[PDB]
Design a protein around this ligand. Structure first.
Ligand code: SF4
Ligand code: SF4
Ligand SMILES: [Cl-]
Ligand SMILES: [Cl-]
Ligand SMILES: [Mg+2]
Ligand SMILES: [Mg+2]
Ligand SMILES: [Mg+2]
Ligand SMILES: [Mg+2]
Ligand SMILES: [Mg+2]
Ligand SMILES: [Mg+2]
Ligand SMILES: [Mg+2]
Ligand SMILES: [Mg+2]
Ligand SMILES: [Mg+2]
Ligand SMILES: [Mg+2]
Lengths: 368, 52, 336, 336, 368, 52
């Protein structure tokens, strides 16, 4: 099934069309995607080695774990300690890569080693289950992620209110993709085409990305994650650039609805509200984050603990260029630490730690 | 890392998806209309969309 | 400076430890043949008209029992394979066991049973051993050394430009099955380990195209096929082109690896052999393999090239190109 | 039914496990020579004009470092000795290591250094190995296998009536030194372990009285001299008379053993060899031994007799008689 | 030094005299010793194989650990549990063999496995030290033993009162040798000569054993522990029997004073008082035990905890004949379990567990 | 298991006895008169008598 989407023929055809449309192209065309899964597709399938010298694919900040502020990671840790001293022991769930994310003050794993109960989970439901198995304890899930990950949390929060669970809390560090994309525009990040993230689209649909192509005239293209989805999108983008088009094509129509996914949208709306948030190594982006509304405030772990997070916490270690990698302005290989002191096993920056981290992906796949 | 799977069982919110000889349970909270035979996109244990 | 799990994961980090310490501290490392410095699947010792192959392997797989096998079948299989990829016929096994105080006598019996059944398949006898019991809560550790006789020895450095690269079967089965078993990931039909002795496979190809035409071999255990290949490329100082579309991979393995977020190329295989053969013998070796019960799924996956020496080039399904990086260390804990 | 510390203490209880399970479950146990069933210090494999001796030994001594030696010197010493008491000349060593996550890199280096220094003394090279790292808090385990060539093989069953029984040096040093080190028992001068390769000692006697006149040998490691002797008596089906007054024992060892309430005859020795020689060659073997740096203290302790077959008779200092019972298990924990 | 006491010549001479004095002897002469260390000497040096068929050496109840009532061992365990429930955690010290002594309700080692703090010590001073290193805990020493072991406890109790230690307690299970010897007399245990224990003599001196040779006319002989000490004593005894003598010879004059050791005697008297006590597998012997006086009652662990020890606790496991072994009426080899299900590693009875146990000694040395 | 030792140091109650190349500390509470050069019988870490 979907064999075509991986067909060596379908691919070599798309690659030929792309080469054709570009041999006549002046200057250079830069296409940016904002999804780590797309970066994985591009890199895993060696798509860059199939592109013409004048066509470039750059990875934007498509990694929710990479951009979660250190201030928030430290906060969660401070609250674990604050609870301990208050006799209360908390059960903290986090994703695997987030678990190892470094900060000036250590990671969740460093905490684990101090005798704290930190558990790695694959989803929020895992956390929900732990909540029912441990009533004598407050289970909290450090929740980072974009729309695609926000939804499962917005749904789990519903199933939790009905059940009237009191030990089901989460530290919201959710972010919105479209906003950050605009910010990069207002800041000079160069690219003439945008490969909109497949899954985040599935949620906010093609509709969620329109406000961008209209307010800046940038041709967007919702794409899947098979190698031919991305090759298609690139071709489609090269052409809307050459023909001066400025619209949004839904190449991933098989999985995305124009309106997207209504349930999730309201499901998320029922609990979260767009707010101003900080993106690690990038700055404070306007209306780019999601925090729990005043009502569902009892689900936020911070409504039970107020900690003093030290100021001036550096976002990255000296020498790390993850901030530029996140902007699609730098390649991980440009980094002096890349593959040296920084590797997936012993990461210096967040971009190398994260599964959707561009550095980890480049490292993992031996980029040419 | 989201991957496609064929639904082979539904039970209200829970579902059993087969990803080529590998089955796993998935919450249908975001795809209520899901039903056996369908093909959904699973992200962190949740169905987020069906395929056409 | 502390020892990390990575230092024993068979990847690059472990390579550092070997080069930064082990090979660097030991000064006497050979007996007139392939020695420690070579880091081959075993050592060789000239003995007149023939050579003695010497190999040793510790096993610490957890749990002791898993779909398709156990620590016992693994001990015999691992040692026999390392002798086999050196071009030697298993002669005898030496079995050391370090048992944790409290292990149920039944477990020990079950492990010994599997070792026995596995050993009889080669066939190869276990002529000597050792037994130690510790208070440490380790359950069990099995260390097996083995001696074999090789008329013509094969090393990781014999790969020549133009040669063809083969694998005796599907890749990623042992590491993915064991990982899936851990995360409770259930299957339509359980994904099994492939642990098994494959001397018959090597022997078959040799008994078909002759030892001189088998230029290199290695069982891709810790760190997987990528590691085994990256190891051959480096030592033979040749480049290796592999076509992703020809690498045999079970549907169940592809699926579980994606969910697990790991590559089936970086995990250990316990019942496979990588073989570099003379370009004009590839087909006969392949077929010779296909005719064995354990090589039914063998396949020519690539060729030895002259460019990118010491590296492994991967031609992706859609035709792209990228390196097949040798893992930093096997992704799965206690895989062997 | 659970495995107990006793099952790996080299005594009688461990003999039960070997007979009640191991030998009873493994069915293929030989390669045309001395095999597993014999439970000799090593196995033999006929190879034309000569035989290959095969031996393996795990080491789990704690602490890793102790007066006189360490786990590294012990690994090399133990394997070389087992080859040596079989009548074989060390050819090559295979080294497996199972390191606990967290070990200080310096410890590993120090162990490797000792292994190297010890290996160079034989001399014998370490031609192949394996490295595993576990989360278990075990520090380190060293498993060494070794191959040797024996022109004429010696077994525990060759003792003949009338033969003389010798030891290359003092008895009880390694086990008592290590026990004393544990209980903080301080000395006027620290009691040291005797761990060391003693191939030169065996070789010397052979190069003096000829291999044919060395009817039996065994290094008295776990379970001590009593165990090594009780083992020779049984397999050779002969009786053994030992005169307590002739057994060499350091003053420090006698003293510590009394305070420790244990017999120096039941604890492991790591630098000694028991040798049964033709009655008319005892003196030359003794002197041949006395001329080596490690056999200066050798001594004829008894003779093979026809009565009390399978048992070991002890003639006490005052002239009394009693059996020298094979310990149930080595008294000292983690002695090797 | 003392080379003579182990001389193969001195021994073979004594052995010859003994044979001489016995070749003319009618019936049979039975000499009983009541010290496990003597049994060790006799057995270790193969002395029995040097004696004439009509001369026998039997081992009496010379093992303080063997005869300590199970009721007392269980009591101590019940108090450990009682303290735990009272929040109080106790540090229990015991000797190595005592640590493994079995009872119908398990041993101190079985307790250890339940998370209790049981420590093996070589002497009471060890316990005293633990008391000073753990003030936040009550350290108690289950104290069994004869006069020789009582003294170090009677001395440690002094050093403890002065220091005014409040966490230095001990469960007294001390016993007196001379009394038990009399009891065996009044009960038929056959022997015409008594090798009085060297070390217990060192304490109570030759004087402490006189009341026996006078009230029953039994020839006693205080002996050391070198092989020639015992051989000497045997010869000396054979002769006092043949010549109808009835006195006490101090063969161990080099280590024992007639009055014995005054300090220890009063040192013991200052704290303990002869009382009626039960001997495991033997019965309740009159004025054979030592308990702390009403004043130094604060040193007894039972003055802080009152436990209900179940009645009818069998003294030994079925089949065990340690009671007869203790009486010198049976040899451990007479026992069906000897060397079968009962060994030092996996003991069925106390006689096999104890270091001075006659069964352990026979087993350990391969008796002929 | 009591064994003979030669006193090579006294310090009030404590003492240092040598048992043939093996030294250990012993309480002299029951042998106050003890002093270097002496030979005592040690039982459970206490001197119980001197030798003549
Ligand atoms: S490699 Fe490491 S250090 Fe360089 S930017 Fe990427 S994560 Fe930061
Ligand atoms: S051997 Fe065991 S069981 Fe028989 S009496 Fe002696 S201790 Fe009791
Ligand atoms: Cl391996
Ligand atoms: Cl051994
Ligand atoms: Mg190998
Ligand atoms: Mg190997
Ligand atoms: Mg191997
Ligand atoms: Mg051994
Ligand atoms: Mg090889
Ligand atoms: Mg041996
Ligand atoms: Mg051996
Ligand atoms: Mg050995
Ligand atoms: Mg290996
Ligand atoms: Mg032998």
């Amino acid at each position: 099934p979907f064999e075509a989407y991986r067909s060596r023929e379908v691919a070599m055809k798309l690659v030929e069309k792309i080469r054709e449309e570009a041999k006549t192209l002046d200057g250079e065309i830069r296409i940016m995607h904002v999804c780590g899964t797309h970066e994985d597709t591009v890199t895993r399938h060696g798509i860059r080695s199939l592109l013409p010298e004048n066509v470039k694919v750059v990875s934007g900040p498509g990694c929710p774990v990479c951009i979660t502020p250190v201030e928030d990671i430290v906060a969660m840790q401070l609250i674990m300690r604050k609870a301990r001293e208050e006799g209360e022991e908390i059960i903290l769930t986090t994703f695997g890569d987030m678990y190892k994310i470094p900060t000036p003050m250590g990671s969740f794993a460093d905490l684990k080693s101090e005798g704290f109960d930190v558990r790695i989970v694959y989803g929020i439901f895992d956390t929900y289950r732990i909540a029912k198995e441990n009533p004598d304890k407050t289970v909290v899930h450090f929740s980072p992620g974009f729309e695609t990950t926000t939804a499962p949390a917005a749904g789990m929060l519903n199933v939790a209110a009905q059940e009237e669970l009191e030990n089901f809390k989460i530290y919201s560090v959710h972010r919105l993709t479209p906003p950050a994309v605009e910010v990069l525009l207002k800041q000079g990040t160069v690219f003439q085409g945008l490969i909109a993230p497949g899954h985040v689209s599935t949620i906010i649909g093609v509709k969620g990305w329109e406000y961008l192509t209209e307010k800046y005239g940038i041709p967007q293209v919702v794409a899947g994650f098979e190698p031919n989805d991305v090759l298609m999108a690139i071709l489609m983008l090269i052409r809307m650039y050459k023909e001066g088009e400025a619209r949004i094509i839904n190449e991933y129509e098989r999985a995305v609805k124009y309106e997207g996914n209504v349930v999730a949208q309201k499901m998320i709306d029922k609990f979260f509200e767009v707010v101003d948030a900080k993106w690690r190594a990038l700055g404070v982006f306007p209306k780019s984050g999601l925090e729990l509304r005043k009502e569902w405030k009892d689900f936020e772990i911070r409504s039970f603990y107020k900690v003093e997070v030290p100021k001036n916490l550096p976002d990255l270690e000296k020498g790390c260029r993850c901030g530029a990698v996140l902007r699609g302005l730098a390649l991980p290989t440009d980094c002096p630490l890349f593959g040296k002191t920084c590797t997936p096993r012993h990461p210096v920056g967040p971009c190398m730690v994260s599964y959707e981290g561009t550095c980890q992906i480049f490292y993992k796949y031996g980029v040419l | 890392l989201a991957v496609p799977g064929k639904v082979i069982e539904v039970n209200g919110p829970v579902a059993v998806v087969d990803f080529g000889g590998v089955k796993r349970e998935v919450r249908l909270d975001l795809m209520p209309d899901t039903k056996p035979g369908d093909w959904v996109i699973v992200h962190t244990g949740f169905a987020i969309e069906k395929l056409d | 400076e502390k020892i990390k799990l990575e230092h024993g994961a068979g990847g690059e980090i472990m390579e550092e430890l070997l080069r930064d310490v082990i090979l660097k501290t030991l000064t006497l490392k050979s007996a007139g043949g392939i020695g420690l410095d070579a880091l081959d699947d075993g050592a060789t010792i000239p003995f007149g008209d023939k050579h003695i192959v010497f190999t040793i392997d510790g096993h610490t797989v957890k749990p002791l029992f898993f779909p398709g096998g156990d620590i016992g079948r693994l001990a015999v299989s691992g040692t026999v394979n390392d002798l086999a990829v050196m071009g030697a016929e298993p002669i005898a096994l030496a079995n050391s066991m370090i048992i944790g105080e409290g292990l149920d006598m039944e477990v020990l019996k079950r492990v010994l049973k599997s070792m026995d059944e596995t050993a009889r398949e080669v066939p190869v006898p276990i002529v000597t051993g050792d037994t130690k019991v510790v208070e440490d809560k380790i359950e069990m550790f099995v260390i097996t050394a083995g001696i074999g006789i090789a008329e013509h020895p094969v090393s990781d450095a014999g790969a020549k430009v133009g040669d063809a690269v083969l694998v005796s079967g599907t890749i990623g089965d042992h590491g993915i099955a064991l990982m899936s078993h851990r995360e409770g990931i259930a299957f339509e039909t359980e994904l099994k380990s492939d642990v098994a002795p494959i001397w018959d496979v090597v022997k078959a190809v040799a008994e078909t195209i002759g030892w001189e035409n088998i230029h290199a071999m290695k069982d891709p255990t810790r760190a997987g096929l990528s590691n085994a290949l990256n190891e051959i490329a480096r030592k033979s100082n040749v480049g290796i082109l592999v076509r992703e579309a020809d690498i045999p991979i079970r549907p169940e393995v592809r699926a579980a690896s994606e969910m697990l977020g790991i590559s089936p190329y970086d995990v250990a295989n316990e019942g496979k052999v990588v073989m570099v053969v003379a370009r004009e013998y590839a087909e006969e070796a392949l077929e010779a393999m296909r005719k064995t019960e354990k090589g039914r799924n063998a396949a020519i996956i690539g060729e030895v090239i002259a460019d990118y020496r010491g590296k492994v080039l991967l031609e992706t399904g859609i035709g792209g190109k990228r390196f097949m990086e040798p893992p930093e260390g096997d992704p799965v804990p206690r895989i062997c």
